[PDB]
Amino acid sequence: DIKMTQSPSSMSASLGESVTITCKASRDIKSYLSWYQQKPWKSPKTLIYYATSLADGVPSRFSGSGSGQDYSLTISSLESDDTATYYCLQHGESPFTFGSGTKLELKRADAAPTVSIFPPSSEQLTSGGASVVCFLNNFYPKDINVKWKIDGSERQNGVLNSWTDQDSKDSTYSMSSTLTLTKDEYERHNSYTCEATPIVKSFN
């Protein structure tokens, strides 16, 4: 079983920059190698075959090099829609194997979110449960703290955060923080607020 070492695991560059991804096989596969691109919740798409051949519809800025056991994918002029994970696959012999992939992200400029707190709905309240979703949209970098304040203090109840993958268009990230609560626990306190690091938005 020919093993494939792909490198690096993850990386970032600013638009225009060029990134090089590599894969090395445990033995000479004679250029029987191919690269793939896979975007979020999507199936993979062939990028190169026979180490150096571009696939149909594929741009010029994507090129393949190497021979023997060493191979590389180079993407010269980086585009925001290039955010994805790339995999190499070797068919020097069966069984064929994939590299562990490289997660590529775009390194843009800092950007503050656009927060939007939302009050639980009636139909939800119709059932003994309430949720307070907060949206932090289009920001960068990806890392960010989210704090909730029931009235004025911080008390335990329940917080859930979910991040989207990087944006193809603006290269930002978005996140949703949802404060969970029981209907009756909600019908008490009055000033709910979600903060981001600060930035605040709330409602009574």
Partner: protein, 213 residues
């Protein structure tokens, strides 16, 4: 055109036995090698094996030698993927792909296999209107308590694409909770009619939720 249709999301109990299908159209599978690939949440691609429909010959990545069994029916242009003694380790997305011999030029849309004891459950869909508030207007939809994955979410049945964000589902309990946000200009929200469409095939659930203040 060359297509590959895969069977629907499947939820089964631990220890069961499944057999997913990949049906070709536009070409004859007798002519290619078909492959099966597994991909767990936010993880990599892993080949299981391949088959040559002509003679029925197969080869498996050793990791799957005792878990999978690939078959094909030249008559029906269909390739199958059988997984036995199911465990949660087997919960993931499964793909079939055509191998021209230089690359994989066609991929199936993939089949979501969930191995669990939980019961199928439709989601509740609660609209999320501002309720307070102005150039922009952001509103969302809240899909709570469904199982298994996945659900799809659209607005106006497809109309309005940009300014859309659907966050990945997380397990809030025995079930999944997911949210989606839309961002239309001020003048719209009011006058216009903004609705979110939810589809939870696993429970043949379709829902449209008109946003209201």
């Amino acid at each position: 055109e060359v297509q590959l249709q895969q069977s629907g999301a499947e939820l089964v109990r631990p220890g069961a036995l499944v057999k997913l299908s990949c049906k070709a159209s536009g070409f004859n599978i007798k002519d290619y090698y078909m492959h099966w690939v597994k991909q767990r949440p936010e993880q990599g691609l892993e080949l299981i094996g391949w088959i040559d429909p002509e003679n029925g010959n197969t080869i498996y990545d050793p990791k799957f030698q005792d878990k999978a069994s690939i078959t094909a029916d030249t008559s029906s242009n269909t390739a199958y993927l059988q997984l036995s003694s199911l465990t949660s380790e087997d919960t993931a997305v499964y793909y079939c792909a055509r191998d021209t011999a230089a690359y994989f030029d066609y991929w199936g849309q993939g089949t979501t296999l969930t191995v669990s004891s939980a019961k199928t459950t439709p989601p509740s869909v609660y609209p999320l209107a501002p309720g307070s508030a102005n150039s922009m207007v952001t509103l969302g939809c809240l899909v709570k308590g469904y199982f298994p994955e996945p659900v799809t979410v659209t607005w106006n049945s497809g109309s309005l694409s940009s300014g859309v964000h659907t966050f990945p589902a997380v397990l809030q309990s025995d079930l999944y909770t997911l949210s989606s946000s839309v961002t239309v200009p001020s003048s719209t929200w009011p006058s216009e009619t903004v609705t979110c469409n939810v589809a939870h095939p696993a429970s043949s659930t379709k829902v449209d939720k008109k946003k209201i203040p």
